[PDB]
């Protein structure tokens, strides 16, 4: 009953933020199981074509997810690539992931979700998604989401020129074949290629690879980016994973962009959200959502 699920998720459009949508347990379990098989049938390194809308972190800010679709166009009017970190911190992670999974099932060739570092049980145990599942449903449903997260794809290349992933580059990343050989389902390890793709950050003050203040993975400098793009015949890295005041922010003379789609992020920041449009000529533009 996929249309009924989407209809009830969208009903709270225009409402005051916070109003819950409580689907049944069996509906939610259905969403995980069907989306999981779609994720596994599709490559772990997606090959996408413009036109596309690209969105960064959401973190359970469900009313801002609805805002994004209002600006970008509700599926299937636009094609979407999300870069991860759907859950934790916000008050409505369940509504957020459920609508994203519902859209992946309904439009499986035009709607895409990458894995962020919060799509990992050990992380979202700490940062709120476990608690939200336990309170509103039960722990077994959280384990069902985990099994589904473990199958998400990790990266995307749009029209052979834009490399997308949640976190960033890896010192272990020599060829795109290494990403394609990552076996799913898997948990995110504490180090290595999959970790770095989900966890690394650019840094304006590092030359080469540096220690990451997060305590996980690395920072990389502008020269790492330029070498990567030249080596792989790419034009742009598109990533998320860090809040930026204007919703998007360029790095390395516009060779990398950070996208963040949760305005007024977890109430603490006064940032805009942004969504990047890529048209058929690979021109990029940004739609801005102020707090
Ligand atoms: Mn995040
Ligand atoms: Mn992140």
Numbering used by the authors: 8 to 298
Cite, word for word, the article reporting this structure:
Phosphoprotein phosphatase‐1 (PP1) is a key player in the regulation of phospho‐serine (pSer) and phospho‐threonine (pThr) dephosphorylation and is involved in a large fraction of cellular signaling pathways. A tight regulation is therefore essential, and in vivo the enzymatic activity of PP1 is restrained and specified by the formation of holoenzymes. Besides this layer for control of enzymatic activity, acute activity control of PP1 is also provided by post‐translational modifications (PTMs), especially by phosphorylation of a conserved threonine residue (numbering 320 in PP1α, 316 in PP1β and 311 in PP1γ) in the proline‐rich PxTPP sequence of the disordered C‐terminal tail (C‐tail). The phosphorylation of this Thr by cyclin‐dependent kinases (CDKs) represents an important control mechanism for cell‐cycle progression and neuronal differentiation, and it has been associated in vivo with an inhibitory effect on PP1.
For the phosphorylated C‐tail, it is possible that the negative charges of pThr320 promote the formation of new interactions with another region of PP1α, thus inducing a closed, inactive protein conformation. To test this hypothesis, the T320E variant of the most abundant isoform PP1α was expressed, purified and crystallized following a previously reported protocol. The structure was solved at 1.9 Å to determine whether the insertion of a negative charge in the tail induces a conformational change or leads to its stabilization by binding to the catalytic protein core. Similar to previous structures, no electron density was observed for amino acids following P298 in PP1α containing Glu in position 320. We did not observe a significant change in the kinetic parameters between wild‐type and T320E enzyme in either of the two assays. This shows that the introduction of a negative charge to mimic the phosphorylation of Thr320 does not measurably affect the enzymatic activity in vitro. According to our findings, the phosphorylation of Thr320 is also not likely to lead to a folding of the C‐terminal tail and its binding to the PP1 catalytic core.
